[PDB]
Design a protein around this ligand. Structure first.
Ligand SMILES: COc1ccc(N2CCN(C(=O)c3cc4c(s3)-c3ccccc3S(=O)(=O)C4)CC2)cc1
Length: 223
């Protein structure tokens, strides 16, 4: 029984493509739905699911919206393997639902910000269906030591746009750079675009939103 709580930007024309975008820790999908609507394509649907509220270890076990538990801020810190995989399964059900209802997998893009971006990278790289690509913003690859081995054979065709703010204090830009190297270990280095933005911190920016629009226009053309 699939029950999805989300803010969805509908296409003005019949939808022939889907973007599933995952917000960052503590948020809802509302703000990112509004942001993606400002750059929307007429035949593209943008699904922004709301993360479930769980206790987060790093925040004194406080209950808040989170895709999985968080324990440390360094690349060697323990990660919530069971939580990351369960959340990836819930996203993979959303992918299969869109597929069951007439949207080809090579017309589905996964994406997200920070924690949500991190889940979208894990899920797309391990998805058994060949997806169009990923829009990974200010994030990292969860369970990075399992890659490239852990990636599905279907990950070869992915097109990746990875963005980062150069002055990000939450997810240092070097962690984004290390993640991009790991992504080029699965996808051809030419199909991974790593864009960094000077003077940008842990946020989006109009140049990043423009890059996302340009990437999706080329990746998801009409019909
Ligand atoms: C292949 O290269 C890499 C490079 C680095 C890593 N790391 C990144 C750090 N990390 C984390 O678990 C967290 C990241 C964030 C956490 S906790 C957080 C905590 C409190 C508030 C907000 C947040 S946050 O904004 O979501 C960012 C372990 C893995 C993996 C692979």
């Amino acid at each position: 029984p699939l029950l999805t709580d989300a803010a969805t930007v509908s296409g003005a024309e019949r939808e022939t493509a889907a973007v599933i975008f995952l917000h960052g820790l503590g948020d809802t999908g509302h703000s990112w739905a509004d942001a993606l609507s400002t750059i929307r394509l007429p035949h593209v649907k943008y699904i922004c699911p709301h993360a479930p509220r769980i206790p987060v270890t790093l925040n004194m076990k406080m209950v808040m919206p989170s895709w999985f538990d968080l324990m440390g801020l360094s690349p060697d810190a323990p990660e919530d393997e069971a939580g990351i995989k369960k959340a990836a399964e819930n996203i993979k059900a959303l992918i299969e639902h869109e597929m069951k209802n007439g949207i080809p997998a090579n017309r589905i893009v996964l994406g997200g910000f920070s924690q949500g971006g991190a889940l979208s990278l894990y899920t797309a790289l391990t998805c058994p269906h060949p997806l169009a690509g990923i829009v990974a913003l200010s994030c990292w690859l969860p369970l990075h030591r399992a890659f490239p081995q852990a990636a599905n054979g279907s990950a070869k065709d992915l097109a990746i746009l990875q963005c980062h703010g150069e002055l990000d204090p939450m997810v240092p830009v070097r962690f984004g750079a290390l993640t991009a190297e790991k992504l080029r270990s699965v996808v051809t280095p030419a199909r991974v675009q790593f864009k960094t933005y000077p003077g940008v911190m842990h946020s989006s920016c109009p140049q990043e939103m423009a890059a996302v629009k340009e990437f999706l226009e080329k990746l998801l053309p009409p019909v």
